[PDB]
């Protein structure tokens, strides 16, 4: 089969890191929890 | 008539060994270069080349012939192509 | 798709050798907009086409990660602010 | 086959003329450094020609060998001659022939035979900048 | 080992929990049903978990 076996892993590993860095940036600086 | 026979049997029909689908390869059977003792031998040797032409035609026809463009498996599919693929090395 | 159609006959290494170097620029495109948020556009052939904070359109490769790339670029651009 | 091997000679005459016509202080330091990195690949071409001569004298070079041998530098000379035409046509000096190399490097990048060339030419041309 | 196949209108003697069964006809006569069930079990189980 021609599919990703070790190229999507270092890619999908980074998508969630980027998401967590944005969501935490909302709370601990802009206080979205306060609203 | 020497080289012509090898040419016909290899799959590039001679002008002496006339390709037919009802009698295969066959010697001319009427010229003065053939005589009854060798006639039987010539008849025997023609059949191998007749089979060889059908083999090579069928292998070329069903191996590497489409990119994925029948649905019958006795004429198309991976197993039949694998049969032709084995056949060339046989 | 021509890999998955025939991966057993002798025409397979030739097709793989073409495809293996034809995917060199497309992988670099994906490695830009995700790691520095630089959108790339060759001639209009990129899989991702060009409030809500989107200036890009979206609506073969693994579609399971294709729509993830669409949001993963704008998050970097949000981190630029 | 002889017809396909002649175009590198015009694509060599164009590369040698850029070093003379565009070596003036009007085009400037960047054009001097640009033509001086154009000179190094011409040096490399002559280095090719010496070893090919040693094979040809003993009859051990043929036109089928020469075709395969000159195909890599055919592309090299094609890029350098096209760049010389473009810098001459727009009368470019300063940063306009430091953007042109940046653009050429992206233009062919799928094989990266030309990308290393244009990257080297920009590295050499941008030091006086 | 994955639960993926690449057939184009053909059979390899196998037809989550989708389009998995074995039929006695397409399975060769010198390969038994016994080992074929073990193969089928591996494919279905790995696909499930």
Short mmCIF file of C-alpha atoms in Angstrom, two decimals:
data_model
loop_
_atom_site.label_atom_id
_atom_site.label_comp_id
_atom_site.label_asym_id
_atom_site.label_seq_id
_atom_site.Cartn_x
_atom_site.Cartn_y
_atom_site.Cartn_z
CA UNK A 1 0.00 0.00 0.00
CA UNK A 2 1.13 3.56 -0.69
CA UNK A 3 0.08 5.57 2.35
CA UNK A 4 1.72 7.52 5.14
CA UNK A 5 3.26 5.34 7.82
CA UNK A 6 5.82 7.77 9.29
CA UNK A 7 5.04 11.14 7.69
CA UNK A 8 1.61 11.77 9.15
CA UNK A 9 2.93 10.96 12.64
CA UNK A 10 5.38 13.94 12.80
CA UNK A 11 2.54 16.05 11.27
CA UNK A 12 -0.44 15.06 13.40
CA UNK A 13 1.94 15.32 16.37
CA UNK A 14 2.28 19.06 15.69
CA UNK A 15 -1.33 20.04 14.84
CA UNK A 16 -2.49 19.46 18.44
CA UNK A 17 0.52 21.26 19.94
CA UNK A 18 -0.42 24.32 17.86
CA UNK A 19 -4.07 24.07 18.97
CA UNK A 20 -3.12 23.83 22.66
CA UNK A 21 -0.83 26.86 22.32
CA UNK A 22 -3.74 28.93 20.95
CA UNK A 23 -6.38 27.82 23.47
CA UNK A 24 -4.06 28.40 26.45
CA UNK A 25 -3.24 31.83 25.00
CA UNK A 26 -6.90 32.77 25.27
CA UNK A 27 -7.19 31.93 28.96
CA UNK A 28 -3.97 32.77 30.77
CA UNK A 29 -3.57 36.16 29.08
CA UNK A 30 -6.93 37.42 27.81
CA UNK A 31 -9.17 35.86 30.52
CA UNK A 32 -11.84 34.26 28.37
CA UNK A 33 -12.79 32.39 31.57
CA UNK A 34 -13.81 35.72 33.15
CA UNK A 35 -16.46 36.49 30.51
CA UNK B 1 14.13 -21.61 -45.34
CA UNK B 2 16.62 -22.07 -42.48
CA UNK B 3 16.49 -18.59 -40.96
CA UNK B 4 12.82 -18.20 -42.00
CA UNK B 5 11.80 -21.03 -39.70
CA UNK B 6 13.50 -19.51 -36.65
CA UNK B 7 11.91 -16.17 -37.55
CA UNK B 8 8.44 -17.72 -37.77
CA UNK B 9 8.76 -19.76 -34.57
CA UNK B 10 10.10 -16.80 -32.58
CA UNK B 11 6.90 -14.91 -33.38
CA UNK B 12 7.74 -12.89 -36.51
CA UNK B 13 6.02 -15.03 -39.22
CA UNK B 14 7.96 -16.08 -42.29
CA UNK B 15 6.74 -15.72 -45.85
CA UNK B 16 7.09 -19.53 -46.10
CA UNK B 17 5.32 -20.28 -42.82
CA UNK B 18 2.01 -18.59 -43.44
CA UNK B 19 0.10 -17.62 -40.32
CA UNK B 20 -3.47 -18.93 -40.16
CA UNK B 21 -5.91 -19.37 -37.32
CA UNK B 22 -7.32 -22.59 -38.79
CA UNK B 23 -4.00 -24.32 -39.47
CA UNK B 24 -1.56 -22.20 -37.44
CA UNK B 25 1.90 -22.00 -38.90
CA UNK B 26 2.26 -24.29 -41.88
CA UNK B 27 4.88 -25.01 -44.51
CA UNK B 28 3.89 -24.20 -48.12
CA UNK B 29 3.40 -27.93 -48.93
CA UNK B 30 3.82 -27.44 -52.70
CA UNK B 31 7.30 -26.12 -53.56
CA UNK B 32 10.38 -28.18 -54.54
CA UNK B 33 12.25 -27.77 -51.29
CA UNK B 34 10.05 -30.22 -49.26
CA UNK B 35 9.85 -33.99 -49.55
CA UNK B 36 7.99 -36.75 -47.67
CA UNK B 37 10.62 -37.63 -45.04
CA UNK B 38 11.09 -34.04 -43.89
CA UNK B 39 7.41 -33.17 -44.38
CA UNK B 40 6.39 -35.01 -41.20
CA UNK B 41 9.15 -33.28 -39.24
CA UNK B 42 8.04 -29.88 -40.55
CA UNK B 43 4.42 -30.59 -39.58
CA UNK B 44 5.59 -31.56 -36.09
CA UNK B 45 7.70 -28.45 -35.62
CA UNK B 46 4.98 -26.01 -36.77
CA UNK B 47 2.70 -26.66 -33.77
CA UNK B 48 5.13 -25.28 -31.16
CA UNK B 49 5.32 -21.96 -32.99
CA UNK B 50 1.54 -21.84 -33.44
CA UNK B 51 1.18 -22.11 -29.66
CA UNK B 52 3.99 -19.59 -29.13
CA UNK B 53 2.23 -16.90 -31.17
CA UNK B 54 -1.04 -17.27 -29.23
CA UNK B 55 0.94 -17.24 -25.96
CA UNK B 56 2.84 -14.05 -26.75
CA UNK B 57 -0.28 -12.34 -28.13
CA UNK B 58 -2.25 -13.17 -24.98
CA UNK B 59 0.59 -12.13 -22.62
CA UNK B 60 1.01 -8.77 -24.38
CA UNK B 61 -2.76 -8.31 -24.44
CA UNK B 62 -3.37 -8.79 -20.74
CA UNK B 63 -0.16 -7.57 -19.05
CA UNK B 64 0.58 -3.85 -18.78
CA UNK B 65 -2.16 -2.95 -21.26
CA UNK B 66 -4.33 -0.48 -19.30
CA UNK B 67 -3.65 1.97 -16.52
CA UNK B 68 -6.92 0.83 -14.93
CA UNK B 69 -8.64 1.93 -18.18
CA UNK B 70 -14.09 -6.67 -18.99
CA UNK B 71 -15.18 -7.48 -15.47
CA UNK B 72 -14.75 -11.18 -16.10
CA UNK B 73 -11.97 -12.79 -14.09
CA UNK B 74 -11.20 -15.36 -16.75
CA UNK B 75 -10.16 -12.55 -19.08
CA UNK B 76 -9.03 -9.73 -16.78
CA UNK B 77 -7.97 -9.02 -13.22
CA UNK B 78 -4.81 -9.40 -11.20
CA UNK B 79 -4.74 -13.22 -11.21
CA UNK B 80 -4.92 -13.56 -14.99
CA UNK B 81 -2.21 -10.94 -15.46
CA UNK B 82 -0.16 -12.90 -12.92
CA UNK B 83 -0.67 -16.00 -15.08
CA UNK B 84 0.71 -14.20 -18.16
CA UNK B 85 3.50 -12.74 -15.99
CA UNK B 86 4.58 -16.22 -14.95
CA UNK B 87 4.11 -17.50 -18.51
CA UNK B 88 6.85 -15.33 -20.04
CA UNK B 89 9.52 -16.76 -17.72
CA UNK B 90 8.11 -20.23 -18.35
CA UNK C 1 -3.90 6.10 -7.42
CA UNK C 2 -1.79 4.39 -10.11
CA UNK C 3 0.29 2.93 -7.26
CA UNK C 4 -2.68 1.20 -5.60
CA UNK C 5 -4.04 -0.04 -8.94
CA UNK C 6 -0.87 -1.99 -9.82
CA UNK C 7 1.68 -2.66 -7.08
CA UNK C 8 2.66 -6.21 -8.10
CA UNK C 9 3.62 -6.16 -11.79
CA UNK C 10 7.00 -4.99 -13.15
CA UNK C 11 5.73 -1.47 -13.96
CA UNK C 12 5.68 -0.67 -10.22
CA UNK C 13 9.28 0.61 -9.55
CA UNK C 14 9.08 2.98 -12.54
CA UNK C 15 5.80 4.48 -11.31
CA UNK C 16 7.15 4.72 -7.75
CA UNK C 17 10.32 6.42 -9.01
CA UNK C 18 8.25 9.04 -10.82
CA UNK C 19 5.86 9.60 -7.90
CA UNK C 20 8.67 9.74 -5.31
CA UNK C 21 10.21 12.87 -6.83
CA UNK C 22 6.92 14.38 -8.01
CA UNK C 23 5.87 14.79 -4.34
CA UNK C 24 8.91 16.89 -3.40
CA UNK C 25 7.32 20.39 -3.81
CA UNK C 26 3.88 19.47 -2.46
CA UNK C 27 5.37 18.29 0.84
CA UNK C 28 7.29 21.55 1.17
CA UNK C 29 4.04 23.53 0.72
CA UNK C 30 2.53 21.68 3.66
CA UNK C 31 5.69 22.23 5.71
CA UNK C 32 5.46 26.06 5.33
CA UNK C 33 1.92 27.14 6.29
CA UNK C 34 2.02 24.90 9.41
CA UNK C 35 5.45 25.90 10.74
CA UNK C 36 5.62 29.61 9.88
CA UNK C 37 2.12 30.29 8.55
CA UNK C 38 3.35 31.15 5.07
CA UNK C 39 0.56 30.36 2.63
CA UNK C 40 1.79 28.96 -0.66
CA UNK C 41 0.20 29.05 -4.10
CA UNK C 42 1.98 27.67 -7.16
CA UNK C 43 -0.46 28.30 -10.02
CA UNK C 44 -3.83 27.51 -8.44
CA UNK C 45 -3.15 23.77 -8.00
CA UNK C 46 -2.68 23.72 -4.21
CA UNK C 47 -5.21 21.50 -2.44
CA UNK C 48 -6.25 24.39 -0.19
CA UNK C 49 -7.63 27.12 -2.42
CA UNK C 50 -7.73 30.85 -1.77
CA UNK C 51 -15.51 37.09 13.16
CA UNK C 52 -14.22 34.02 11.33
CA UNK C 53 -10.61 35.06 10.47
CA UNK C 54 -10.30 33.06 7.25
CA UNK C 55 -9.07 34.34 3.89
CA UNK C 56 -8.80 30.85 2.37
CA UNK C 57 -11.17 28.35 0.79
CA UNK C 58 -11.32 24.62 1.18
CA UNK C 59 -14.81 23.42 0.28
CA UNK C 60 -5.25 11.63 -3.72
CA UNK C 61 -4.02 12.54 -0.21
CA UNK C 62 -5.43 11.56 3.17
CA UNK C 63 -8.56 13.69 3.61
CA UNK C 64 -8.41 12.80 7.34
CA UNK C 65 -5.59 15.36 7.73
CA UNK C 66 -6.53 17.62 4.78
CA UNK C 67 -9.17 19.55 6.71
CA UNK C 68 -6.79 19.68 9.69
CA UNK C 69 -4.29 21.61 7.56
CA UNK C 70 -7.02 24.16 6.71
CA UNK C 71 -7.36 25.19 10.35
CA UNK C 72 -3.70 24.62 11.26
CA UNK C 73 -2.49 27.58 9.18
CA UNK C 74 -4.83 30.23 10.57
CA UNK C 75 -3.87 29.22 14.10
CA UNK C 76 -0.25 30.15 13.32
CA UNK C 77 -1.46 33.46 11.87
CA UNK C 78 -3.41 34.01 15.08
CA UNK C 79 -0.20 33.35 17.01
CA UNK C 80 1.44 36.02 14.86
CA UNK C 81 -0.76 38.64 16.53
CA UNK D 1 22.44 14.12 -32.38
CA UNK D 2 24.89 16.81 -33.58
CA UNK D 3 22.01 19.34 -33.76
CA UNK D 4 21.25 18.91 -30.05
CA UNK D 5 24.84 19.54 -28.93
CA UNK D 6 25.47 22.91 -30.68
CA UNK D 7 23.17 25.19 -28.46
CA UNK D 8 25.62 25.16 -25.51
CA UNK D 9 28.11 27.13 -27.61
CA UNK D 10 25.77 30.09 -28.05
CA UNK D 11 24.87 29.57 -24.37
CA UNK D 12 28.65 29.86 -23.63
CA UNK D 13 29.19 32.94 -25.78
CA UNK D 14 26.37 34.68 -23.90
CA UNK D 15 27.96 33.78 -20.56
CA UNK D 16 31.38 35.12 -21.53
CA UNK D 17 29.99 38.41 -22.87
CA UNK D 18 28.19 39.35 -19.61
CA UNK D 19 31.50 39.57 -17.76
CA UNK D 20 32.76 42.22 -20.18
CA UNK D 21 29.73 44.35 -21.09
CA UNK D 22 28.28 44.48 -17.56
CA UNK D 23 31.58 45.16 -15.76
CA UNK D 24 31.28 48.88 -15.22
CA UNK D 25 30.67 50.82 -12.05
CA UNK D 26 27.30 51.97 -13.38
CA UNK D 27 25.87 48.48 -12.81
CA UNK D 28 28.01 48.41 -9.68
CA UNK D 29 29.54 46.12 -7.08
CA UNK D 30 26.66 43.65 -7.15
CA UNK D 31 26.97 43.12 -10.92
CA UNK D 32 30.75 42.65 -10.58
CA UNK D 33 30.22 40.01 -7.89
CA UNK D 34 27.45 38.43 -9.98
CA UNK D 35 29.61 38.06 -13.09
CA UNK D 36 32.52 36.81 -10.96
CA UNK D 37 30.38 33.90 -9.76
CA UNK D 38 29.35 33.37 -13.36
CA UNK D 39 33.09 32.98 -14.08
CA UNK D 40 33.55 30.04 -11.69
CA UNK D 41 31.16 27.79 -13.61
CA UNK D 42 33.02 28.63 -16.85
CA UNK D 43 36.21 27.52 -15.06
CA UNK D 44 34.40 24.27 -14.18
CA UNK D 45 33.35 23.83 -17.84
CA UNK D 46 36.98 24.08 -18.99
CA UNK D 47 37.92 21.59 -16.23
CA UNK D 48 35.39 19.19 -17.80
CA UNK D 49 36.88 19.74 -21.28
CA UNK D 50 40.45 18.81 -20.21
CA UNK D 51 39.57 15.29 -18.97
CA UNK D 52 37.29 14.75 -21.97
CA UNK D 53 40.26 15.60 -24.22
CA UNK D 54 42.43 12.96 -22.50
CA UNK D 55 39.73 10.37 -23.20
CA UNK D 56 39.26 11.50 -26.82
CA UNK D 57 42.95 11.36 -27.86
CA UNK D 58 43.06 7.61 -27.10
CA UNK D 59 39.79 7.13 -29.02
CA UNK D 60 37.85 6.26 -25.86
CA UNK D 61 35.20 8.98 -26.21
CA UNK D 62 32.27 8.88 -28.62
CA UNK D 63 29.29 11.10 -29.43
CA UNK D 64 26.95 8.95 -27.32
CA UNK D 65 29.32 9.49 -24.39
CA UNK D 66 29.68 13.21 -25.15
CA UNK D 67 25.88 13.66 -25.26
CA UNK D 68 25.43 12.22 -21.75
CA UNK D 69 28.49 14.17 -20.59
CA UNK D 70 27.38 17.64 -21.76
CA UNK D 71 23.69 17.29 -20.82
CA UNK D 72 24.22 18.45 -17.14
CA UNK D 73 26.11 21.65 -18.03
CA UNK D 74 23.68 22.34 -20.90
CA UNK D 75 21.10 23.27 -18.25
CA UNK D 76 23.74 25.28 -16.33
CA UNK D 77 24.62 27.38 -19.37
CA UNK D 78 20.90 27.71 -20.25
CA UNK D 79 20.20 29.33 -16.86
CA UNK D 80 23.24 31.64 -16.96
CA UNK D 81 22.56 32.82 -20.53
CA UNK D 82 18.84 33.42 -19.88
CA UNK D 83 19.76 35.43 -16.78
CA UNK D 84 22.26 37.50 -18.81
CA UNK D 85 19.52 38.27 -21.37
CA UNK D 86 17.06 39.30 -18.64
CA UNK D 87 19.54 41.55 -16.79
CA UNK D 88 20.48 43.22 -20.09
CA UNK D 89 16.88 43.65 -21.30
CA UNK D 90 15.62 45.52 -18.23
CA UNK D 91 18.99 47.30 -17.71
CA UNK D 92 18.96 45.91 -14.18
CA UNK D 93 21.27 47.12 -11.42
CA UNK D 94 21.23 47.23 -7.65
CA UNK D 95 18.52 45.05 -6.14
CA UNK D 96 16.63 44.22 -9.32
CA UNK D 97 19.25 41.60 -10.24
CA UNK D 98 19.25 40.38 -6.65
CA UNK D 99 15.48 39.78 -6.77
CA UNK D 100 15.76 38.06 -10.17
CA UNK D 101 18.01 35.30 -8.79
CA UNK D 102 15.65 34.81 -5.82
CA UNK D 103 12.83 34.37 -8.35
CA UNK D 104 14.78 31.96 -10.61
CA UNK D 105 15.61 29.76 -7.59
CA UNK D 106 11.91 29.17 -6.88
CA UNK D 107 11.03 28.87 -10.60
CA UNK D 108 12.88 25.57 -11.09
CA UNK D 109 13.02 23.76 -7.76
CA UNK D 110 11.43 20.37 -8.43
CA UNK D 111 14.75 18.73 -9.32
CA UNK D 112 16.99 21.42 -7.71
CA UNK D 113 19.61 21.29 -10.44
CA UNK D 114 19.16 25.05 -10.97
CA UNK D 115 18.25 25.93 -7.37
CA UNK D 116 21.80 25.35 -6.06
CA UNK D 117 23.12 27.49 -8.92
CA UNK D 118 20.80 30.44 -8.26
CA UNK D 119 21.39 30.10 -4.50
CA UNK D 120 25.16 30.28 -5.09
CA UNK D 121 24.80 33.27 -7.42
CA UNK D 122 22.70 35.10 -4.84
CA UNK D 123 25.17 34.24 -2.05
CA UNK D 124 28.03 35.70 -4.06
CA UNK D 125 26.11 38.70 -5.42
CA UNK D 126 24.68 39.81 -2.05
CA UNK D 127 27.97 40.24 -0.15
CA UNK D 128 28.64 43.81 -1.49
CA UNK D 129 24.98 44.60 -0.75
CA UNK E 1 -2.65 -6.77 9.55
CA UNK E 2 -4.71 -3.67 8.71
CA UNK E 3 -8.13 -4.60 7.35
CA UNK E 4 -7.42 -2.90 4.02
CA UNK E 5 -7.72 -4.40 0.55
CA UNK E 6 -6.96 -3.05 -2.93
CA UNK E 7 -9.00 -5.34 -5.24
CA UNK E 8 -10.56 -4.02 -8.42
CA UNK E 9 -13.64 -6.23 -9.14
CA UNK E 10 -11.74 -9.40 -8.12
CA UNK E 11 -11.47 -11.83 -5.19
CA UNK E 12 -8.68 -12.96 -2.87
CA UNK E 13 -11.02 -15.56 -1.16
CA UNK E 14 -12.28 -12.96 1.35
CA UNK E 15 -15.48 -11.11 0.31
CA UNK E 16 -15.76 -2.24 11.40
CA UNK E 17 -17.45 -5.61 10.71
CA UNK E 18 -18.07 -4.61 7.11
CA UNK E 19 -17.82 -6.96 4.11
CA UNK E 20 -15.96 -9.68 5.99
CA UNK E 21 -16.91 -13.31 5.39
CA UNK E 22 -15.42 -16.30 3.63
CA UNK E 23 -17.20 -18.45 1.08
CA UNK E 24 -16.23 -22.08 0.55
CA UNK E 25 -16.18 -21.86 -3.25
CA UNK E 26 -13.60 -19.10 -3.78
CA UNK E 27 -11.28 -20.58 -1.13
CA UNK E 28 -8.87 -23.08 -2.85
CA UNK E 29 -9.41 -26.81 -2.45
CA UNK E 30 -5.91 -27.51 -1.12
CA UNK E 31 -6.12 -24.76 1.52
CA UNK E 32 -8.54 -25.88 4.27
CA UNK E 33 -11.39 -23.96 5.87
CA UNK E 34 -9.60 -24.24 9.25
CA UNK E 35 -6.65 -21.91 8.59
CA UNK E 36 -8.98 -19.63 6.60
CA UNK E 37 -11.12 -19.02 9.68
CA UNK E 38 -7.99 -18.07 11.65
CA UNK E 39 -7.07 -15.58 8.90
CA UNK E 40 -10.60 -14.14 8.94
CA UNK E 41 -10.55 -13.86 12.75
CA UNK E 42 -7.26 -11.93 12.65
CA UNK E 43 -8.58 -9.47 10.07
CA UNK E 44 -11.91 -8.78 11.79
CA UNK E 45 -10.42 -8.50 15.29
CA UNK E 46 -7.59 -6.11 14.30
CA UNK E 47 -10.11 -3.98 12.38
CA UNK E 48 -12.34 -3.77 15.46
CA UNK E 49 -9.84 -2.72 18.10
#
